[PDB]
Each structure stands twice: as C-alpha cells, then as structure tokens.
Amino acid sequence: STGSATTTPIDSLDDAYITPVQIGTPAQTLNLDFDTGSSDLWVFSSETTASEVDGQTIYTPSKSTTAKLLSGATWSISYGDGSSSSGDVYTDTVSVGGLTVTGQAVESAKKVSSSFTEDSTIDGLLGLAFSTLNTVSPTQQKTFFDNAKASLDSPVFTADLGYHAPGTYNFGFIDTTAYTGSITYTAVSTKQGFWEWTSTGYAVGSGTFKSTSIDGIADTGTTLLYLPATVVSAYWAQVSGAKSSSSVGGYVFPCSATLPSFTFGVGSARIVIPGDYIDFGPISTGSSSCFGGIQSSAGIGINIFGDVALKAAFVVFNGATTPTLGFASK
C-alpha cells in the first residue's frame, strides 16, 4: 500500500505545515502537524479543557464506532519550544492520503499549553520520529509510520515541503518526478530516537564550502535551521547590520537586506537554501528589523535541520531495518 497527502503552510511565513488526517468511523478529518522530531499522534478532542480550545477541530471518540479507550493509558509531552500537552488514549482507525492503519493510538488531549490553544490551524500532531520516544504510559505505543510499515510497498516516507506553497507527504513510495538529479543517502543514528544524521559541511552564499561534520536531526516540526554558533556567526557576518539580539531571542537583520543563500552538505551532494527562505519577516508588526531563519543551536543541545532546510529538498525517511535519510534537490 501507499499514501499521498498534501501538506500546506499554516501562515504566510511557513511557520508550520498541516496535513489532513482521517480519524475514526465515520471519518473525522483533522489537520495535523506531521513532526519527524516526535513520536506521539495527539489531537484536540471532546476531552480538551474547553478554555484551551480556540477554533481547532476536535476529535470526538464517542462519535466513532471504531474508537476504543486504551484502558489505563496516559500521555504527556513537552516540546523543544517549551510547549506541552497531555491526556488519555484511544485506539482508532487513522488514514493519511488513502493509507489506513487500524488500531492506531490516538492520544486525546485533556490539556494543551497556550501556544497550541493560540494556533487555531493545528488540530494536533502526528509524530514520525522513532517509537522509542512515544510518551504513552504504562505501555508505549507505535507511530503511524511504524504501524503502517509492514503494509507499505517500501518502508519509507518522504517530505516535500513547499516554500510559500503546498507540498506533499508520501508513504510507501518515492515519487521520482518530485526531485531533480539523484537522491544522496546518508547514515542515521536512532540512539536518541530522532532522524539524526551528520552533514558534511556548509557554505555561505557564493563562498567556499567548509568541510566539517555537523550532527543534527531532520525535524519537520521545527520551523527554523539551528546550527552551531560558529556556523551561524559566519552566515550572519555576510549580512550588513545583522546582529544577535538577546531581547528578541536570536539573530535579527535589517528588513532591507538581501540575504545570501546557505548550502549544506549531504555526503558529496549539496543542498542550497535560497536567501529568501531565511527571511522570517518583521520581529513585530511594522518593524524594519527582521528575524533570521538560521539561528544558533547553542543551549538547545542539538542541531536541528528544521523546515527552513528541509523545504529546500526532497527528503526520504527510509525506515528499513538500517534507517537512512536521503536528500535531493528539487
């Protein structure tokens, strides 16, 4: 089997992407944030504290003939940005782009933090990291991909995120029309439960490529590109007036600037992030100071190839017995 679903930016800055997901019988369609950096499929629901719901579509398990309470199971998750959610667990039928999993753990939120409440466009998350990170207790649950895997034509999914445009998540096949040139594959470590890999270096604009190992994670649920301070300093040094602002929380630059591209290495291959992808617009409405899309990972504890990087590529998440990641230009 295969599935194919369109993913759409939630706003004009590509802050996140939502993908429609069918849950239950009859189907309840919720727009979920597919997150290769976490491993819980959780939804706003009829159980979510009412004051914490502001415009989201909710899952109502009592209206699904295939929903079953997973007795005794609870979940609680905190994300890298400090947001969080928690609740209890149902199993139900879940379909993405025509690919159906029965008995999927659907984690029903009783509580969500303010960032989730304030984002009316995101009805929940669908985690696509390794199932070892799943937070359900006392019995850890599998991700949608892990459950689907044995049925898939090939044990893969691909992320093809758009720049200010829709894109695609495919499951079970590689669309050879969706990228240019070849796919370069690179090793993955699952030791931390992430799609963790090592980039072979970087370039700033038309500058020479610096060969250097950068360990990081491919994370569709993170907006920006977080890299070591040395790398990020080298990038912003090429932008007149750019500076790191502790008050704002990162690198800012004059909105009048033209930003250079940023290249990252995948083996001997190179992925180029256009400068426009790195402009995240005014820090506040009407400001002429703009927020950078490449930021330091210092004090995050890990480098993160978030949407800024991933949307410049066609990305293969290969969940074979030995997992790998593939990147192609597009």
Curated annotation (Swiss-Prot):
Q: Which reaction does it catalyse?
A: Hydrolysis of proteins with specificity similar to that of pepsin A, prefers hydrophobic residues at P1 and P1', but does not cleave 14-Ala-|-Leu-15 in the B chain of insulin or Z-Glu-Tyr. Clots milk
Stated name of the protein: Endothiapepsin
Task: Give UniProt keywords alphabetically.
Answer: Aspartyl protease, Disulfide bond, Hydrolase, Protease, Signal, Zymogen
A molecular function annotated in GO for this UniProt entry is: aspartic-type endopeptidase activity
Q: What gene is behind this protein?
A: EAPA
Q: What is the lineage of its organism?
A: Eukaryota, Fungi, Dikarya, Ascomycota, Pezizomycotina
Q: Which residues of the full protein are shown?
A: 90 to 419 of 419
List this protein's GO terms for biological process.
proteolysis
Q: Where is the Peptidase A1 domain?
A: 17-328
Query: What EC number(s) is this enzyme filed under?
Result: 3.4.23.22
